[PDB]
Every structure is written in structure tokens, then in C-alpha cells.
Amino acid sequence: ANRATSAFLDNPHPVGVNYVDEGSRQFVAVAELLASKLIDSSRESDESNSDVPFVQAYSKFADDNPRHLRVKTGGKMANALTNVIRSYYSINAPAIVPQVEIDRLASKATVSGDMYNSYAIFNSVPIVEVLSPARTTVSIVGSDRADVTMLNTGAGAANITFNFGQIAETVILKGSVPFQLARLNQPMPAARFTYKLRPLDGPFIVVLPVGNPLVISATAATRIQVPLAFNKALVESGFQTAMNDGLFDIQNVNYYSSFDEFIISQYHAQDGINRVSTCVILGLALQAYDQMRRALPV
Amino acid sequence: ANRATSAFLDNPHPVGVNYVDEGSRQFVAVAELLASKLIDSSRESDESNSDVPFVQAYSKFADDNPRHLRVKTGGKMANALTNVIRSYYSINAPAIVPQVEIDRLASKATVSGDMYNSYAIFNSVPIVEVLSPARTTVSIVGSDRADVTMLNTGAGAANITFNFGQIAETVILKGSVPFQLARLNQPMPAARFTYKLRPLDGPFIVVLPVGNPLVISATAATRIQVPLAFNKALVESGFQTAMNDGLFDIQNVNYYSSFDEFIISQYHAQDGINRVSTCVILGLALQAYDQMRRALPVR
Amino acid sequence: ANRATSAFLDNPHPVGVNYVDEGSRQFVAVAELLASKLIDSSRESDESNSDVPFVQAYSKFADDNPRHLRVKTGGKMANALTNVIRSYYSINAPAIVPQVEIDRLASKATVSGDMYNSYAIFNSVPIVEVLSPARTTVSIVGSDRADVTMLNTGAGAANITFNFGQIAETVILKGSVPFQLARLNQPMPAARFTYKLRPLDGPFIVVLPVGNPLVISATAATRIQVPLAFNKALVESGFQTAMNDGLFDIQNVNYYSSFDEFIISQYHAQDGINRVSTCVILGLALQAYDQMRRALPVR
Amino acid sequence: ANRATSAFLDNPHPVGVNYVDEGSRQFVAVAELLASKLIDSSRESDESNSDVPFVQAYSKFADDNPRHLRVKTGGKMANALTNVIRSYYSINAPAIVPQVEIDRLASKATVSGDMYNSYAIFNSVPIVEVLSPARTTVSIVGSDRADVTMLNTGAGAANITFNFGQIAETVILKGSVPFQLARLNQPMPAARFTYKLRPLDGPFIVVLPVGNPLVISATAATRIQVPLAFNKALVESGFQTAMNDGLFDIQNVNYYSSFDEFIISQYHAQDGINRVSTCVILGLALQAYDQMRRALPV
Amino acid sequence: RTVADGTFNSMIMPRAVIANEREHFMKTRIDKIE
Amino acid sequence: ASWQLYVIHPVQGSLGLVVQLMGDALTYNVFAQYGNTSASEFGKTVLTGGATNTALEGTKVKFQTKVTAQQALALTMALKDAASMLSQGELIGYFEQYINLALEPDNLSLQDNM
Amino acid sequence: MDVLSKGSLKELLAHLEKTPLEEAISYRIGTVPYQNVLISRNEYYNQLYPDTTSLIDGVSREGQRNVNGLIMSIISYVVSGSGHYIPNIGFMLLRRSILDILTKHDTGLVTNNLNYGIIARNLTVSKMNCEQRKRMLICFKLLAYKDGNQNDYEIYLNQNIPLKQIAPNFIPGDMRTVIHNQDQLAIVGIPAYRLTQSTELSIRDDNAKSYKLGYVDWYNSNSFLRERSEFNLIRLKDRDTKYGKLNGW
Amino acid sequence: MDVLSKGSLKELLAHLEKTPLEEAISYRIGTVPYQNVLISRNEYYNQLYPDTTSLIDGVSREGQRNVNGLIMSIISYVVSGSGHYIPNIGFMLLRRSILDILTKHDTGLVTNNLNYGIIARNLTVSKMNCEQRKRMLICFKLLAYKDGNQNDYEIYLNQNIPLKQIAPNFIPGDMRTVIHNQDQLAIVGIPAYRLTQSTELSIRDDNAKSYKLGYVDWYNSNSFLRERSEFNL
């Protein structure tokens, strides 16, 4: 027998346990709101042929007027936002921002800081285990779209077990050729191209006929509660930006292709519902990081 | 000969034939406009630390004042939108919304029911059929990007026929190794990495040499008329939400991973010009559904 | 020799040893009083179509004003009550509620946390052991009414020993056919249908003739000191609600059908007198839990 | 192979589809509210040694002052309450009460006919099927506490499959002697007295050793949404009163020992979620019938 | 059960048999004898 | 939390010993090595010194006793009296050394009582 | 909505005289009548709510092209507010009033073969409420008087005990009986109870509440006719009169 | 609540001078720490919420009878607000001030064998915030300078680089260092008005939140209730 598992589901590293309280949640929400105004003010300044809208936005964000001979860095708010992002990723991060500094930055604007007002759909497909008998080869490639390639070399048809976990809401299976799939202790139906599955409905058995390889394409959707200001496009940009800037470069951590893979992998770890709340706050901070750094490159 | 086809193009189930008149089209546009106000008011309530903006917008959407101890679901407007969405998907879904309710809700806000003001680009790759000789194997995977893996075990080179349909506008073919492709009864060109093709040009022949397998990646773009309020990101999010909530669980229907796959599959079926009109209204309805549930969540 | 025992009396898991001081007892009594106000205010709010009665009661209960955007779950008072309930059930459950929060929530209302003002009657029949000879089969079924089915296949009549726990006050035995029962080393009386027994007197002996089986139905009554606010109907409802919500899902704990089985089983274990006091406080806490969840519903 | 099922789950008759709108729901709520005051008026009469509290309560309920000549019947409200109870039980029972009369009676007191404010716990144990192999005897008896007696006369141990449905939340199993139970395709644990199970988990297999019979006692808890005024003690008493008074004597209907059995049987029928709402309204109507008839026997 | 000191837990701790000279001497002697 | 259970089956004897130490509370029970059914490894208790739980779950280490049951019982009785005035390491170290090495306790006063 | 508001026999028959048949017929495709379906009721349940569609719902359904479907569309319009999809009936039949179809031989429609029991079963008389059954019985009596089938109507009432008790009392040829009749036939009206903007579980109940809430809006709308304040502005031909007689009655 | 309110090093040292060791020791039996448990957080999740218990939670826990247990109880009181259950320590030792235990040899306690790395691991230093860590390092420096272990404290800081950045800038025995110190050590203070009466997911965060919300009420009413019992002593 052989076991195949998704690459991104392996060994999720522990996440930080700091800056997750109500006061720190408001600061991340404050940074996101003020960073958005920086982007809008720069567009207004360019159109109006006046730097007055940008000066107000920078002064609110950085507590200092812009200067031609001083580099525009975002002030102490930028440093605090950078440091909390490092802490969220790993427990080994320093987490040196004082509580007095966080509290004073949350008073710049009034926001609830609630991280459960809305939801977001995550597309990463979690194949926890694919169990295949002898004389069969199974390969799993991809995260957003998982392609499972199976070859049957033996004499007769083989049964292959698929485990999609208990967290994902729905899973769609599509095959290169029609195939048979059924739950445990259930009769097999007539072969068809597309199957819609509920991952909580036990493992699924796939009949693999001898001959040409069968390829199954898997797509999944999972809903995770997120704040109303969450924007997946901006979070994804911030995640890529943070890796290139070295904010995630700590010892004994795992690296992912996208924030989609990061949040799903931490969800599937043992006691993973603890980590999912911290990952959402990290995503919001990355949304603030992307807007702030695009407006004030360094 | 062996025939291979894309999985998502196979057997498009018929779409609903109800709630497609001007009055129903106005109701969907009104719901989308009011749902956008609902999501913006909730943001304003967070920034102002006051529930007045949200209560103000919920009253217009649901015709009722929010009361504590009662779950906020969207009122009668949510009931109509959710059930109309089910009817658009399948013809087996019942039509249970009265005409009096549609007319009343369509009068809440002034807006046009026009669904052909603008256009959108859809990236599903239609591979209607791939015909191959006896000693070759062909496998097709993927919808947004289709990878066709071909292996030749015969003595000589084989010809594979590619049919991309008549609906897609342009198809870009990229190969793992340089390969030769030409139209029917046309001399073969020199080996090239990439080909830009017009699907209306006709069936395309690919020379598959004996040896290592050749993988062809296909990307396609098509233009469909949509209303100006159409937002692809919002429509796709609503499609996954409707699937999770089970609104698309109807007998004898086909399930798609994305709205891009759904609209392209219905386009390539017979009477697809009539089907695609209903799908556009469904996409706008799913955009309203996505914004409504994100404003009013349930754990 | 064969030994048979009641299923619910087997291996009572240890109960919690925290939150049993005078201050913690006041917190449970305050929660019960404030939960009763909450359930009454919801009735008034529904009748009058106004949120004023419910807002006043919820603010007293949760020390916070209801908000449309948020979710009404009972606030910090609900969080402490649910976590203390788990602590009472098992010693494996942790103590995570600080003493500052317990003292703060006990000051909301002025009550006396006395759990011995009144008494209550519990109907679980304890059959500690039934001893039978080799050629007899004895089966014990039931907790509220225990039916003991006995069949003798041997040549001679068999003597079967019935041991009821020393705690129970009165046990009433009724047989399908008249039978003879007497105390140890006492003369056998004439066969009669009904016997009234005090378990403290000693083990009882039942004479089984050879032939048709004899079924004995047992009922018991035990008095346990409880506070005046104790309501068995509300306590039983809360016990099943806590089980369905997963509050009692702790490692290495035993599960019971009713609160009556739980309190009687813990009484019959060693250090039972110490255990019963904690169970009574858990009964009042479950009474507060049931009234709180019914007032604030989650689908 | 033999199949055993619970007696009360067999062939639930269709319930009525009338008097379940908002207007009729407030009529049942008003009747429950005004019948409660009818009972409470008797206690107030004793304190003041006067019949004027009872006269006031009867006049509001019956729209007429009580008379010493005739027996107190309750007037139009009593006639309307009796007829709607008949209609709820069976679809064949006529819906003879006009809407206008329901309209007028529902305006007597201010109430909201919302039947989903709270929840109640129903204790009937659903055993859809017990599958047993040959040479084994299985007997299912009881509704509140189901005793399953199993005897195998074969050479070796037999496996018994238990199916508790998908509606009940918690089922507790207690055996006369320790036994082994596990889900499908799971290892079998050591013999244990008490098992806590969730019916959604799946079918359960019990090892039945050869020898003395094994008896398993089953208790179940199901949560059904009910109005805040629901009182199970009064609903159960009203169910017995209605059955004795001949309010359920209609052709082709099934009869049940308690409202507990009645509500669970319709829940487990096909498309059973439709029947639950109607049965809940019938329970509130029976609560009003119990109080009204105890104050005014006929 | 009374409160637990740390006396028992230090006894069952692993020891550095290579770094300690006395422990190394003892195992060389037993290996030679065997 | 530290708890320890010792079950001694002397091959050269007719009686066995069960010693349990939960914290600083020591309990023992002497049991007969004859008449045992297949269900349990312990016969009837002949001498009692408290309540001992043999169903405790943990790592099991097998050892062979180097002293008789009378010698083991003598130290157990002495250790019970000095349970409050001795540390857990001393209580264990003296017991293990005598059972496994036949090493008499270094504490002179404890040695005399045994 | 207007047909459901009529509360007396005189108003109902007066409305049917001025209403053509095309109002009964619907030109929307609808769905097939008898199907077990799952609908969404998010105010109450997360799962889909089973129900069975029927012809007396407020939403148009597909109807048979025979005469049976036409009569069944008329009754559904009276009791539910909407009809069914029967196209290509013809200009001559569609321009006639509903009363003319039910009561007059000059229309050219032959309906003497109709079976009241089968029509009632197809309309799900068991699911109808008291007002709905009274309205359908009015349609049956008018059809019986047109075809000379008065005896058959009485026997059908004798077989069905609940229908006999609520059967309206009027002779379909005499106007004096209609004026005396005091049966309340209103389905929608001003509610004495508390009416909220909340959904209902079943299709029939939810669709009925939509008309009830719509009627309240219609009552306060500018389209509603207020007899107390604007009686002089009404045209004389359609003004309310005490001596109002249907033609031929 | 009083100890968590101090925001400066000189306030914290002054409080420890007046506070007996009795206030740092709990008389509640508590639970064993380092246990993986499931807790109920119904404001957020329907399912039970995984968490692990620790000594630096706000709830009293069972403590060991060694000197290590007493030092851990002192630090837990400073960083979390509650001590641990160590029974029958002694009347004379319990009367001494907390600063006397940490900085004076007259108490009769020996702390030379303490390993600072082991104590930090037992207190879950990885889960402590910046303010809590600074308070813990203050207690280590006081213990180190009493025992003549100044070098060991510096070497321990070199190994743990993140702890070195937040090390307090005061030398025990020098009054000038305490006067000019500018550290912020206030775990609990008068809340910013934005704080709401809402629960937190973790055990530590919720207990810290409980202290924050109840500080305003404690500030107004503690003086009179303390005086009502203090007078006529």
C-alpha cells in the first residue's frame, strides 16, 4: 500500500500568540483604514494638481509632515505594522511592540476590530490521504486545482480511497474520462464525469480500471469568518510582498505559495481552530501592508 | 479512432425559462443595487460606532425594522432572490415566487433591467473533441488552462485533430516542446512553441512524433454581453456560496467548479444563445446573493 | 456464583473540587435568579412587540447593551456559567474562571447561597449487587424502574440475594407472580405481590421455585437536600441541553441518561456525601443554563 | 436476516395543512394566554371569597357573562379551539372554522404567533431498524426507554446492526452486562456498560456472544424549536384529554401514547420537517385545551 | 494525593556517560570483563 | 504529579506485596499468591495497609526482587511511618535499592525500625 | 388581489361580470403542477424545505389545453389570484366575461361532461380553506345551472359532508337571493391581528401572505377607490347602486 | 489587580515592599498545569475551543513544595495576578515582604541552585507579552544580584537574544538607576473607552481582559472596603 498527501498540508508551523487581543485587533483595523486613505489621497493629489490631500493623509498616518529631503517611511505606525506581521507568522518572532504604542495607534480612528462580521471563501483543496493498493501509482500535483494521476498496472480493477478532511465544505471531482466513485459501504453508480461531494461524508472509493491513466481534477471551497474589510486580492498581494521583504524569514517555519494555502494548512493541523483566528488578523495586516507600501515604497 | 472531450462541456443541463421578462430583470438589478448599499452601510456602522446606517439600509432591503432576538435574514427580498436563483439554474427547480411579489420589489429602486450594456471576458477553454489514431493516447485536464498530454507508441508520426468549437474568439496554444500545427489540407509549418488560433478557422491537425510525450497548454478568451454592474469577482464568490448553502442541489443537474465553466458549457450546447441570456441574469443574481450574505452572516 | 449490578452505578467518575466555596455558591444563585428574569422579559417583549423589557434584562444579565451587528450569547456571565458547569462534572475539566470574575458576577444580585434550605426526591433505584447460584440466570434492566428477570433451571429452589444501597430510604418490590422475600436469617413469609423495604436493615433473600420465571419491579425514593429554587423539571432539561451541546464531553468520564442517575450514582461511591454537595450546585447551574439558552436561541 | 423496528415509527398519517398561517397562530397563542388566566382566576376567587375574578376571566374568553342556568362551555373560542385541534391531527378532518372568526378571536390579546423562539427536548427513542443475522432473536419494546432483548442460539458470536436515524442528537446505550459496540469499519473496543452515540455517525455493530441474553436500554434526546409559552407537562395532559374526548377519532389515522411519540414519528417520516411545524402548533393548542377544559368541564 | 516535589524527577533524568569520567571508566571495565 | 505502584511477586514465597505511593501517602496490601482465578493476578488480601489501585495506567518496568516478602514488608511498614518526614526521592530510593540490590537504607534510624 | 378582496356574493359576481376571461389565463410558462420539490426558507431552517407544488398556488402553472383546464384555471384565479398557461384559446372566448363562460350557453363552450369530484381533487380541495371552498362551490353551482345539472350538484354535496355545511345559498337565476346572502368570501382584507413582514413555510401560505401584504399597500395606494370620499367622481355606469342587477337575473 | 496596575519600576518595587508573601500564595486547590483542555467559547464557535493550561493564567494552580515552586508563585503573581497553592510554608516566611524574599538574605531561603532557563520554560515565556517579560526579568535580576550571580544573568541574556532587547535598565543596589528608569510595566490600566464587555478566545487573554474591565470598579471602591476592615486591628 502507498499513501499520498498534499505538499502544503505537511507540518504547519506554530503561529504567534501575541497581538490578538481586542486592543491589538483595533490597531490592525486602524492601519487598514488609514492605509486605504493614503492610496485614495495620492490619486486625489495627482488629479487636483495639489499636494494638499496627500499631506493630510500622511500626517494622520505618520504623525509628521512629509518632507522633500526625508524618506517617506510611514512613521512609527509602519514600524509597528511591520513588527506585528513578523509576530503573527511564528511563535519564535520577537514581538517587541509595547502595549502603550499599540493602544495609542488604535485611537487614531474608531473601528470595532471585530473579525467575525463576514466570511470569505478559500479555494485550496485539502487531500489529507489517498490510499492506493499495490501495482498502482498515484501522484498529487497542485493546491488550488489538485490533479491526481493514477495508473493501474495489476491484473484487475483497483479501489482507491480518498480523504478530503472534515473542514472543507464542498469538493467537486472532475475526471479526464468517466469514472465510478461512491462512499464506503455504498453501491457504485454508473460512470460519469463530475461528482459533487461533502467531505464530512466519510472516505470515498474510486474504481480504477486497468489501462490508460485516470486523472481527477479537484476543486474545494471553505468558508472562514473574516472581518468586513477583508479583501482577498489585497491580502494575496501583501503576502507576496511580505515574503520578498523578509518579514517571514524566521528559523523553523514553513513557506507557502499563497495565503490561501497558509490558512487552510493551519486549519487542518491538530487543534487548528486556534490558529485560524490569528491567521485572519495576519491577513488583514497584510492588506494594510500592501496598500501602505504601494503608496510609500522603500 | 479515440475521442476525448473536456469534462465541463459534457451534457449541459437545461436552464430555467422563468423570471426572464423585463419585470423580473428589473427585480434582479434592484436587488443587486440594494445589496451593495447593505454592505457599504455595515462598513459605515463600523467606522461610526452607530447602528443607524445599517438599520437604515436593512429597512429598505427587507421592508422591516430590525428587532433584537430575531435573526436578520433579508426579509421577503431574500426569500424571493434565493428561490429565483434556484429556478435559473435548472428547469426542474420549481417556480414559487408570485408576480405580485416581483413587481412590488422591482419598484423599490429606480434602475434599468438592461443586461447587454457591457461585455466580459471568460477564460474557459472549449475542447469539443480530440480525435486520435489507434496507437496514441490523449488526456485532457483543466478548464481555465487545458493540458493535453499525447503519447505516440506507433511506428510513424500520427495526426491528432483538434476541435475548439465556434464560440471562442481566440485560442493560444503553448507546447512543452516545439510542435507543428496546421489547418485541414494545409502544408505543415516549422516547429514552433506557440500558436495563436481562430476557432472558426476549422479543425486543426497536430503532428505527434514518436518518442517523449507532447503536452499542449490551451488558453481561451470569449466575449459575452453583460450589464455594467457585472463584477466577475463578486459573481464567482456568490457561485461558491450558493453551492455551499445547497441551492444548486436539484435532481438531474450538472455541477461546475466555477461560473466561468457554467456559462461556457451552456453556450456550447444547442440553443446556447438563448441559454446564455438566462445565465447572465443568474450571475447578477449571484452577485446580489454574495453581497447580501456577507452583510448578514450566520455561524 | 453470579453477580449482577445496575449499569448506571458502575464506576462513578470523580466530580470537580473547585467553585464550591461560599462566593462561588452565590454566583450560581445569582445566575439562576438573573436567568429567570431573562426568560420572563423575553415573554413580555414578544407580547408587546417592544425590545424595552428584553434590553433591560439583558443589560442586567450581561452588563452590556444589545447590538444589531453583534450576536447575543449572554456575555461574560454566560461564559463563566458554561465553563463552571464543565468543572463540576469532572475533575479532568480545568478551572479557567478567575476569582475576580466570580466575585464581580455575584454582586449583581443579593441572594443567600444556601443549598440546604429544602429537599428533593429522586427516583433512581440502586441495585448494588444481586447474587445467584450456578444454575440461575439474573438480568437487571432499567434505572427509574428496575426489572429483574430470574429463571431457575436447577432441581431445587434457589436463594437469591438482593443488595440495595444503604443510601436509599424506601424500596418497593412488585412481582409478576407472588414470591417470598425475607431478611437474612429471618423466616420466609407467605408469597405476596408487594414488599416495602428499608435497605439499611440488611441484605434480602428471594426464594425462586423451579419453573416459570419471576420478574421483580423495583422503585426507590431518596431525599437529597437542595436549595429552595431547585426545580427538577428545569434541571432535567438543562442536563440534556448540556449533553447535546458537548459540555460534558470530557476524557475518562461516565455518561448518564438523567440528572437523577448522576446524583444517585455519585452518592453511592466512596466519599459520596462530599460528592453530592457538588452535584446539587451543578443542578442549580444547569437550571440557570436551561433558562438562559431558551431565552437566547441559536438555531 | 430479520428486521425489527419501533412500533410507534410505523406509517405516520399526514397532518393537516390548515390554520398554520400568522393569523391562526396568534389565535392559538391568545387561547393559551386567556386559558391560563381562566385557571389563575379560580385561585384569586378563593382569596377574595368572590366570583367576580372568574366572571371577568370567563367574559374575556367566551364573550359572554357566565350563567347559573347552563354549564360553562367557553363560547365561540372553545368551539373554535376544539375544531382546529381536529384539523391539525389529520388532513381528512374538515377545516370548518371561518377565517373571519379566527381573525376576531386573535385580536382579543396582543401576542406574536412565533413558534421558533425557544426549544424543547423530546425523549422518544427512534430505532428505525435493527438488522440481525439468522438464529438470533431481537425484540424492541418501549418508546421513552427502549429495551432491546437479543438472544443468539448459533455456534458463534453474531453482529447486530443498529440504526437510530439522523434526527436524534444524543442516544445513550446501557447494557445489562458489558458489551462491545463500534461504528462501521472501526475496531471494536473493550466491553463497557454505557455508550454515548450520535445517530448521524452511522450504523452501529454490537457483538452478541452466545449464552445468556443481552438487553440494551436506550434513551434519546431531540431538540425541536417551540414557542416560549410551551410547557411539556400541560401539552402531554392535553393530548390525553383530546384522545379521551374523541377529538382524534378520524378514519385512517394512527394513535400514539404521548405527544412525545406523536411528534417524533412525524419527524422521521419522509419530508418530515413539514410536519414538525404543524405538530408544534397542535401542542400549543392542546396546552390551551388542557387549561380551558380543567376550568370548565363538560 | 499530596503535592509533588521535584526529588523523584531529578533521579530518573538521563546522564552524560561520555563526558563524565567516572561513568566512562565503569562501562569500559564491564565491557572488558564481558 | 508523581505516582508510583509496585507489584512484587516473590518466587521464593507464598505471599505478594502491592505498594502504592501517591505523593507522600504510602499504602500497601499483602495478597495471597494461591487460589487465584485466571481473571486476576492477585488472591485475597491477608494484610491491609490502605487502599491500592492496581488499575493505574502507565509504563511498566519488569524487575526481579532480591529480597523476600518479609523483608519487603518490613521496609514498607517503616517507610509508612516516615512518609511525612522524608522526601519522595528518599522514599523511592530506599525502596528500590532494597528490592533490587538488597541494599539496606543508609538512614540509621530508618534501618533500625525496619 | 382585487378578486381576493371581494367579501360578499354580490361583489364577487359583479366583479366576474366585468372581468374578461383573459385575466384568468396567464401567459407565463410556470411549472408542472404536481411535483415534490425542495424550497429555501432561510428564516426558519438552514436545510431545504420539502413541499409539493399545486394548482391553487399563487404562481402560474402549466395547464392542459382541454376544457377541463380552462375551468380549472378560472377556479384557481378565483381562489388563488392567478391562473394557468393555456395559450391559443381564441379571441372570441377570451373577450367574454368569466360569468358568461360559467353561466351562458351563447359563449360556444360545452362543459356538461365535467365531473365535479375530479375537478375538486385536481384542485386539492383538502388543502383549501373555508373561504376557498365556498368560492369554488359558487363556480360549481353556476356551471350546474348552465348545463341543467342541478340534481347532480346536490348529490355531489350529499357525498361530501363538509361541503354541504358551507354550501352558499343562492339560486343562480334570481338576484334576490344574491342580495340576501351574507356569507363572507374575503380571502384578503384589512387584518385585525398583527401582520408582520415575515415569511411562511409552505408555498401556498407564503404566496397568500404576499397578497395580504400587497392588499394593505393597495388599500393605501392611489389606485384604490375610496367610496366615502370620492363617490361623485365615479362614473354613473359603474357607480354603486342599491338596485344593482346582473343582466338576465 | 493592584500589582498589575503599576506602570513604572519604582512603583512596582514600592508595592513589593509593602506586600507580604501571603498575597502571592493562594489557598485554593486549583488544577494541575500543562494540560490540553477543551473550553467553551460560545460567543465565537459552536464547538469546543482547544487550549492548554499554564501557570501564568489568572487562575490559581497546584504548586510544588520546593523553593522553585515558591519563586514561580511570586513571579506568577506579578505577571498574572494570582499565586499558586503551596501549603504550610511557614508563618515567619509568609509575613516577610516579597522584596525581602527576592533581595534579602535574612529570610532564610536559598536560591543559588535556581536555573533561570528552566524557570522561564515552566512559566511559558514564549506565550508572555513584552510587559510580562520585563516584569519577569526584574525578578531574575533581583535574585541574581542577591546571590552574586550577576555574570550568570548576563550570560543567560546573551543566549536569549529577544529577551536581551527588552531587558530592564536598572542595577540592583543603585538608587540612581531606579530613579531615572523609564520603563512601562502596566498590564492593567484605566481602559481606553473602545474596550467592550466581550470574551476572548484564549484562557490568558480572557483572564487579562477580566482584570482590565474590573479595574475601574475596583479603583473606586477598594479604599473604603479596605479601611472598613483595617481599622480597629
Author numbering:
A (entry chain K), D (entry chain F): 2 to 299
B (entry chain J), C (entry chain H): 2 to 300
E (entry chain U): 25 to 58
F (entry chain W): 287 to 400
G (entry chain P): 1 to 249
H (entry chain Q): 1 to 233
Quoted passage from the original study:
Banna virus (BAV) is the prototype Seadornavirus, a class of reoviruses for which there has been little structural study. Here, we report atomic cryo-EM structures of three states of BAV virions—surrounded by 120 spikes (full virions), 60 spikes (partial virions), or no spikes (cores). In the full and partial BAV virions, genomic dsRNA segments and a number of RNA-dependent RNA polymerases (RdRps, VP1) are packaged in a double-layered icosahedral capsid consisting of three proteins (VP2, VP8, and VP10). The spikes protruding from the outer capsid shell are heterohexamers composed of a VP4 trimer capped by a VP9 trimer.
Visual inspection and 2D class averaging of purified BAV YN15-126-01 virions on cryo-EM micrographs revealed two types of virions: one surrounded by more spikes on the viral surface (hereafter referred to as full particles), and the other with sparser spiky density (partial particles). The ratio of full to partial particles was approximately 3:1. Icosahedral reconstructions of full and partial BAV particles (at ~5.7 Å resolution) revealed that they share overall structural features except for the different number of spikes on the virus surface. In the full BAV virions, there are 60 spikes sitting on VP10A and VP10B, respectively, while in the partial virions, there are only 60 spikes on VP10A. The thicker outer capsid shell is composed of 780 copies of VP8 and 120 copies of VP10, with each VP10 molecule being surrounded by six VP8 trimers. Two VP10 molecules are identified in each ASU, VP10A (closer to the icosahedral fivefold axis) and VP10B (closer to the threefold axis). In contrast, in the double-layered full BAV particles, 120 spikes made up of a VP4 trimer (for membrane penetration) and VP9 (for receptor binding) emanate from VP10 located at both type II and type III channels. The binding affinity of spikes at the two channels appears different, resulting in detachment of half the spikes when the partial particles form. BAV entry into the cell is a highly ordered process with stepwise detachment of viral spikes, as reflected by the variation in spike arrangement on full particles (120 spikes containing VP4 and VP9), partial particles (60 spikes containing VP4 and VP9), acidified particles (60 spikes containing VP4), and core particles (no spikes).
